[PDB]
Design a protein around this ligand. Structure first.
Ligand SMILES: */C=C/C(=C/C(=O)C[C@H](C)C[C@@H](C)CC[C@H](O)[C@H](C)C(=O)C[C@@H](O)[C@H](C)[C@@H](C)OC(=O)C[C@@H](O)/C(C(=O)O)=C(\C)C(=O)O)CC
Ligand SMILES: [Cl-]
Ligand SMILES: [Cl-]
Ligand SMILES: [Cl-]
Ligand SMILES: [Mn+2]
Ligand SMILES: [Mn+2]
Length: 293
């Protein structure tokens, strides 16, 4: 596995007009999946990380916006990174996006971290773009290889015992952190339960307790659910993604929860910005932003 040649070819399109492809070989991508799969399984499903680090939200195959994020925050390993999921679907270059993230995960396994989003489930990315991109530019056998790799991704992370990070949000079945550590890998994403909620649920300011979710799966939760959860587990903040927001970041429940979305001009329809959160040594949060077109 010529990791440096793979990374060099991926960063080579820096400065080009967005849309230009990086077509790695079939065997190189297969090696990225298998090797990163081993590292995911060797590390806990509930990561315990330390600040300072940068946290990014949804990317959704917007590869040149991912390159802009590294230009703003520093290419690895100049800064520690935690991504919250949703690397494929919706966008035009899911392949370049996930390949660079897997390559960086292999080269810097203890300074680069990737969480699982709801689009890292096979039933979702079969419909919303990644399957068609794999079938067109490679083959469906490689798509299954990606799927086997996604099945081993960690699902949550706690930064310095104070910031709880996951893709979606909280769960009515989440009573102990040990419930997350007991989840065995590899695994598919069920249509209900704790693992489903951590990848699907959303906060809602017009809901008391647990409500229904407009996505057709999981639940919504209100501000008091967040406050009680933080107090019970001695936490300061819940950091999640999952929802496109106009400013790229959006606080909730008196700045006790923050939503991160790192894909500006989301799939050509929205005029949103993309945000990346910077956590310093004292856990103070600031933002670097890709402003909309
Ligand atoms: C792992 C496999 C698996 C998945 C399931 O659980 C399937 C569930 C039971 C049923 C399917 C039909 C749910 C699919 C969702 O409805 C889709 C993915 C969805 O969320 C569309 C989204 O637009 C909903 C409808 C919308 C109300 O939410 C938003 O607007 C959020 C917005 O940020 C967003 C997004 O999806 O992130 C947008 C605008 C987007 O569509 O890209 C088990 C079988
Ligand atoms: Cl509530
Ligand atoms: Cl900025
Ligand atoms: Cl500006
Ligand atoms: Mn999502
Ligand atoms: Mn998303």
């Amino acid at each position: 596995l010529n990791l440096d040649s793979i990374i060099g070819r991926l960063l080579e399109v820096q400065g080009s007009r967005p849309g230009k492809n990086v077509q790695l070989t079939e065997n190189e991508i297969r090696g990225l999946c298998l090797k990163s799969r081993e590292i995911f399984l060797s590390q806990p499903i509930l990561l315990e990380l330390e600040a300072p680090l940068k946290i990014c939200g949804d990317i959704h195959g917007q590869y040149y916006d991912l390159l802009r994020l590294f230009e703003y925050g520093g290419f690895p390993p100049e800064s520690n990174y935690l991504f919250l999921g949703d690397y494929v679907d919706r966008g035009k270059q899911s392949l370049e996006t996930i390949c660079l993230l897997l390559a960086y995960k292999i080269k810097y396994p203890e300074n680069f971290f990737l969480l699982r989003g709801n689009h890292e489930c096979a039933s979702i990315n079969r419909i919303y773009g990644f399957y068609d991109e794999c079938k067109r530019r490679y083959n469906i056998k490689l798509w299954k290889t990606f799927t086997d790799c996604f099945n081993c991704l960690p699902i949550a992370a706690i930064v310095d015992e104070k910031i709880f990070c996951c893709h979606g949000g909280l769960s009515p079945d989440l009573q102990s952190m040990e419930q997350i550590r007991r989840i065995m890998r590899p695994t598919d994403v069920p249509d209900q339960g704790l693992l489903c909620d951590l990848l699907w649920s959303d906060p809602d300011k017009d809901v008391q307790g647990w409500g229904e979710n407009d996505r057709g799966v999981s639940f919504t939760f209100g501000a008091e659910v967040v406050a009680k959860f933080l107090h019970k587990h001695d936490l300061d903040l819940i950091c999640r993604a999952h929802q496109v927001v106009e400013d790229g970041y959006e606080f909730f429940a008196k700045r006790q929860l923050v939503t991160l979305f790192s894909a500006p001009n989301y799939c050509g329809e929205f005029d949103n910005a993309g945000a990346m959160m910077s956590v310093d040594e004292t856990l103070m949060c600031s933002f670097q932003i890709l402003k909309p077109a």
